[PDB]
Amino acid sequence: AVVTAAGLAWLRQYLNPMGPDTTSVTGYPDGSAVTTCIADYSNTFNVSFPPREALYCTGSSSSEKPTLVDADNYAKIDKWSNYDITLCVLALPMLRNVVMLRLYPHTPTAFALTEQTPNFPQRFPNWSVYSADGTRFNNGDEPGYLQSYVYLPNVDKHLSAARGYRLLSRGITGIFSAPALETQGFVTACQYLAEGSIQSQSIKSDAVRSVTVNSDGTVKNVESSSQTVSSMPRYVFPLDGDNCAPSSLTETYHQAYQSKATDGFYMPVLSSSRDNPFHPPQPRAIAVYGSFLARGCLDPVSEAHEADGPTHDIYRLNVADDVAPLFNTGVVWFEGISPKFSLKLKTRTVLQYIPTSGSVLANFTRHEPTYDQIALDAADRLRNLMPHAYPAAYNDWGWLGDLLDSAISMLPGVGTVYNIAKPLIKPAWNWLGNKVSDFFGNPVARDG
């Protein structure tokens, strides 16, 4: 009838992954009664405008040949560096490849993706270039944007030696810096559930056509193999690329975070579900749903037009991973950023493992299968109230825990012992205007 210490610690580390107090690591409070080891991955990256040495072409140029550095089309990228730029970071529930960074000369109208599969996607220190017309880039084209994946190798090593896994919490911090007289810019951040699933796109086979003109050989196998079949299965994310522009996100989600660029960001990505079961590691090729073009059977048609029905475009990322289901997808935009910027990305991903016999993980097991229903109910209750992001320096929230968790833990059902803990009011996270009030009306003076 009262939240235990383990449940409270899990709630703290789930809602505030990078809270300075969050030193110990605690598992999911479901009493799984399985031998588990909890791994915490803290990584730091220093992103800035890449030099020519770390740029590669995604086009057919590097198709069978390995990655090809840009053949001194870098002059166009310097032209980008003349003016302000835009920097998107997209945190899908990918376990490795924690975030995807993208650099634009100016803010796009949508989060476009290429219909053709890219060539050798590059891990963070290296980038890959994409043309301005939404296609893969070969040398001698018009670069449109740069893209890279931020990769955690230890996560891959540990996922190899694990019977099961589940993501416990994940946070991303974006400490922003720029030269003096160059601090101008804005930052927007949002979270939303993009519930991916294993789907296969509809493709066409090739009909065989033979003309046996021989005197004795007149088979004439004109059979039509050009039927509609299913491609190989991929984990497809229904992220709305066309609606990922910063303005649309700001005006769609109320808990979206907006501020000056210098404030940075701090996204504690959250789960969209009450439960969090273990899953066996099963990496798959990842893809993103697009939009359909031919209406097909959306109108009265014949069988010949059934095949070309509303088939949604599937954008292959050429990246394989196992995703954390029911976890939100985060997206942050830095618009109007000085090209001489420096973003210190800090990621903290804590996840639970069931070790495989004889594996490395088996030497770090930790057997307290604690149970706490109240903590899980409180997490579900709080999912819809927490803002999607905070300023990079805004950690160790006073309202969190002893106040917010206590003031919310006694609504669920009648699981209430203390009569009244504290009234809860609607906060106003107006970081742009310095009129921020927390969940209890206490103003938040600027600590950075």
Residues 1-20 that bind a second copy (CB under 8 A): 1
Q: Which residues in 148-167 contact a second copy (CB under 8 A)?
A: 154, 156-158, 163
Instruction: Determine how β-strand 314-321 pairs with β-strand 284-289.
Output: antiparallel
What minimum distance in Å lies between the beta carbon of 88 and a second copy?
16
Q: Does 183 bind a second copy (CB under 8 A)?
A: no
Tell me whether residue 32 or residue 338 sits nearer to a second copy (CB atom). Answer: 32
Name the DSSP class of 343. Answer: E
Distance CA 351, CA 389 (A): 21
The correct pick among 19, 125, 134, 233 for binding a second copy (CB under 8 A) is 233
The correct pick among 2, 198, 222, 425 for binding a second copy (CB under 8 A) is 198
Please answer whether residues 329 and 239 qualify as being in contact, where contact means their C-beta atoms are separated by less than 8 angstroms. Answer: yes
Q: In 114-244, which ranges are continuous DSSP H helix?
A: 153-160
Per-residue tokens: 415: 């699981």
Distance CA 115, CA 110 (A): 15
The correct pick among 181, 302, 418, 420 for binding a second copy (CB under 8 A) is 302
What minimum distance in Å lies between the beta carbon of 49 and a second copy?
22
Q: Does 420 bind a second copy (CB under 8 A)?
A: no
What minimum distance in Å lies between the beta carbon of 78 and a second copy?
26
Please answer whether residues 93 and 330 qualify as being in contact, where contact means their C-beta atoms are separated by less than 8 angstroms. Answer: no
What minimum distance in Å lies between the beta carbon of 242 and a second copy?
8
Q: Does 293 bind a second copy (CB under 8 A)?
A: no
Q: Residue 348 in 3-state DSSP? A: strand
Q: Residue 375 in 3-state DSSP? A: helix
Q: Which residues in 374-393 contact a second copy (CB under 8 A)?
A: 384-385, 393
What minimum distance in Å lies between the beta carbon of 338 and a second copy?
22
Q: Does 269 bind a second copy (CB under 8 A)?
A: no
What minimum distance in Å lies between the beta carbon of 267 and a second copy?
16
Q: Which residues in 338-377 contact a second copy (CB under 8 A)?
A: 354-358, 360-365, 367, 369, 371, 373
From 80-88, 308-316, 331-339, 400-408, give the range in contact with a second copy by CB under 8 A. Answer: 308-316
The correct pick among 205, 222, 441, 442 for binding a second copy (CB under 8 A) is 205
The correct pick among 5, 71, 208, 293 for binding a second copy (CB under 8 A) is 208
Cβ atoms < 10 Å from Cβ of 82: 9
> What distances in angstroms separate CA 208 from CA 86, 162, 202, 223, one per listed residue?
49, 46, 19, 6
7 alpha carbon, distance to own chain's centre: 26
Sign of CA dihedral 150, 154, 155, 157: positive
What minimum distance in Å lies between the beta carbon of 340 and a second copy?
26
Q: Does 134 bind a second copy (CB under 8 A)?
A: no
Distance CA 288, CA 175 (A): 28
Q: Does 442 bind a second copy (CB under 8 A)?
A: no
Distance CA 376, CA 395 (A): 22
Q: Which residues in 16-75 contact a second copy (CB under 8 A)?
A: 23-24, 30-35, 37, 39-41, 62-64, 67
Distance CA 439, CA 385 (A): 9
From 9-17, 70-78, 305-313, 335-343, give the range in contact with a second copy by CB under 8 A. Answer: 305-313
Q: Does 424 bind a second copy (CB under 8 A)?
A: no
**Helix or strand run (H / E) with residue 163:** strand 162-177
